[PDB]
Structure 1
Amino acid sequence: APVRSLNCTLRDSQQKSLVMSGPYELKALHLQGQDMEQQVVFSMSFVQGEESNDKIPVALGLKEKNLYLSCVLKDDKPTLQLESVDPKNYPKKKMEKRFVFNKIEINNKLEFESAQFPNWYISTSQAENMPVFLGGTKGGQDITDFTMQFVS
């Protein structure tokens, strides 16, 4: 059948919102009131991959954009990028592994682990207006926990 998808927003565990601020640029900042319209709306697709009760493979596309978060090596490091795709072919159920995140639910928070790079996670900095990135631990000073808000 078709791939199933939900519209949503994400906030980090400091309640920082995610916004587009430049070509293929994604930043986290504290937002409230009118400025909240700036936040990115995702289409979260439920994709093929290894799955358990609390670990669900997803892709994260920008709503009605042919842009997906993906994990690739850049200058020999696992990195997070926005990647353009052919809009005729996406989303699909069998997303390529660079696009797949394991959405993990622990203690009412979500983590998004790269399926391609085990124990690398979508991460934000504690500082305001810094890039969203792929970080090589769910430990330390950077933030690896999120909440989802469902969008109409």
Structure 2
Amino acid sequence: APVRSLNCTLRDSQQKSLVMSGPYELKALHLQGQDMEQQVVFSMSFVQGEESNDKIPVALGLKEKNLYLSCVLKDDKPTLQLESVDPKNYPKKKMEKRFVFNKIEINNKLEFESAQFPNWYISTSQAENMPVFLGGTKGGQDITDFTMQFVS
């Protein structure tokens, strides 16, 4: 049947919200009040891939945009990009590997590991207003844990 999707927001474990930073980048900042309308709403699709109780393969699209987070090599490194797609073909159950994240539940938070690049994670910096990036380090300065809020 169709692929199933949920609308959601993400916050990092320091409680920073995610916003657009130009057309193909996201940034994380501290947000509260009227400014919370600026946050990005995701359409999280539940996609084909290796699965376990606590490891669920998803794609992260921007709500009602033909834009997905994806993991590609850039100037030779796993990086996070926003990638355009053909809007008549997406989302789909069998998403290409660069679009797939393993959504991992650990200690009442979530981590999003690249299915394409094991042990690389959606990350934020401790500083305000810096890019969301694909980070090969857990337990350092880079923040790799999030909470999800389910949106109408």
Range into which the TM-score falls when normalised by the shorter chain: over 0.9
Tell me the matched-pair count.
Answer: 152
**Inter-partner Cα distance in structure 1 for 2:93 and 2:138:** 27
| Aligned partner of residue 8 in structure 1, secondary structure | strand
* More displaced 10-residue stretch of structure 1: 135-144 or 42-51: 135-144
Q: d(CA) in 2 for partners of 1:100 and 1:64?
A: 19
In the TM superposition, residue 61 of structure 1 has moved relative to its aligned partner by 0.1
Aligned-pair CA distance for 1:139: 2.5
Q: Say which is worse superposed, 28-37 or 14-23, in terms of deviation.
A: 14-23
Three-state SS of the structure 1 residue aligned to 2:21 is: strand
- The alpha-carbon deviation at position 128 of structure 1 amounts to 0.1
What is the Cα deviation at residue 77 of structure 1?
A: 0.3
Could you tell me how far 1:25 is from its partner in structure 2? 1.5
Give runs of ≥4 in structure 1 deviating > 3 Å.
none
Deviations 1:40-78 (A, max 9, x none): 000000000000000000000000000000000000000
Q: TM-score, normalised by structure 2?
A: 0.99
How much does 1:138 deviate? 2.0
In the alignment, the residues of structure 2 paired with residue 83 and residue 108 of structure 1 have an alpha-carbon distance, to the nearest angstrom, of: 30
Q: Distance in 1 between matches of 2:69 and 2:103?
A: 13
Name the CA distance, whole Å, in 1 between partners of 2:116 and 2:51: 14
In 2: Cα distance, 1:4 partner to 1:119 partner: 26
For normalisation by structure 1, the TM-score amounts to: 0.99
Tell me how far apart the structure 1 counterparts of residues 103 and 81 of structure 2 sit (CA, whole Å).
18
Q: Distance in 2 between matches of 1:16 and 1:51?
A: 28
